[PDB]
Each structure stands twice: as structure tokens, then as C-alpha cells.
């Protein structure tokens, strides 16, 4: 048999450093604690990893498993995606570039 369903979300418009903070608060914790943690952090990268955990839990339910109450978040990644590029007029004629970055967020949910 198998365990550990996956779920990803590609090219999400958040900076990748500011989403590596929230994923440090989940690694190794059960699924019961993690949703409760993510509901009470007022960051933008809270309301995304919520949806990634809920989709991973739903994959594990409605494809393979039972025992929603015995699942543990064992791995979580943030990888960098394709950056947009724009400009901005600085003073005295010149200009300066501006990155606009994207991240790839994955969550793996083993049993225990």
C-alpha cells in the first residue's frame, strides 16, 4: 500500500522569504494543531498554506486513506518561481528595476 498524499500550488504571488517563515511553524506537527495555528497568524502567507493543507487532507481522504485524526505534516517546501520584471522612474532621469517574485508551495502529509 501507500501513504503520504501530496498537494502543490504553483506560481503564487508571494515573496518566497516571507512564506518560509510560516512553514517553519508547521514542520513535524499534527494536522489538528496546524490549521488552528494558521487561523491565528495575520500574514498573507497564512491564507495559502491553509488551502494547501486542506487539499492535501482531501486527497488523502477521497483517494486512499481513512484516519484523518492520525496524519502528521512531515515535509514542507518553498521553491522560487518565475519573476516578473518592471521599472520605476527614479529622480534625475534614470530608472531602477523591480523584481516581482513567485513561489511554489508543497505539503506532504504522512500518517505518523
Amino acid at each position: 500500500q501507500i501513504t503520504s498524499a501530496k498537494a502543490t500550488a504553483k506560481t503564487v504571488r508571494t515573496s518566497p522569504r516571507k512564506a518560509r517563515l510560516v512553514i517553519d511553524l508547521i514542520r513535524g506537527k499534527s494536522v489538528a494543531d496546524a490549521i488552528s495555528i494558521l487561523k491565528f497568524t495575520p500574514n498573507k502567507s497564512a491564507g495559502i498554506i491553509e488551502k494547501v493543507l486542506m487539499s492535501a487532507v482531501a486527497n488523502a481522504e477521497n483517494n486512499f486513506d481513512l484516519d484523518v485524526e492520525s496524519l502528521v505534516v512531515s515535509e514542507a517546501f518553498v521553491n522560487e518561481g518565475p519573476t516578473m520584471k518592471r521599472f520605476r522612474p527614479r529622480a534625475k532621469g534614470s530608472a531602477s528595476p523591480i523584481n516581482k517574485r513567485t513561489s511554489h508551495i508543497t505539503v506532504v502529509v504522512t500518517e505518523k
Partner: protein, 56 residues
């Protein structure tokens, strides 16, 4: 002034040991067992002090 040199790969990860996030004060409710903040109105319960406040 102007930085003298490239800061290496090590001093990034030696500065950033105090750029953490922390959660503070998560307690179980008295009416649903759902982890909700202390000294705060429980959002899905509506049950501060065992009294329903959000009433119309």
C-alpha cells in the same frame, strides 16, 4: 557610505536567527475544544465566558 564587500553565505544565516515568527496563547475552549486565543472572543463558538455574545 557604501558596503565594502559582498557579505558571504554564512553571515546571512547568522543574522537571520532572529527573524522568526511565533504564536502566542492558544487555549482550548470551554464549549467546543477548538484552539482559540486566550482573553479573546472565540470566533466560531461565539462563546466568551460561556455566554453567547454575538446575538441579534
Amino acid at each position: 557610505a557604501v558596503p565594502a564587500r559582498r557579505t558571504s553565505k554564512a553571515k546571512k544565516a547568522k543574522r537571520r536567527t532572529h527573524y522568526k515568527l511565533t504564536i502566542k496563547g492558544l487555549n482550548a475552549c470551554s464549549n467546543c475544544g477548538e484552539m482559540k486565543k486566550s482573553h479573546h472572543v472565540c470566533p466560531a463558538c461565539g462563546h466568551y465566558d460561556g455566554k453567547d455574545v454575538m446575538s441579534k
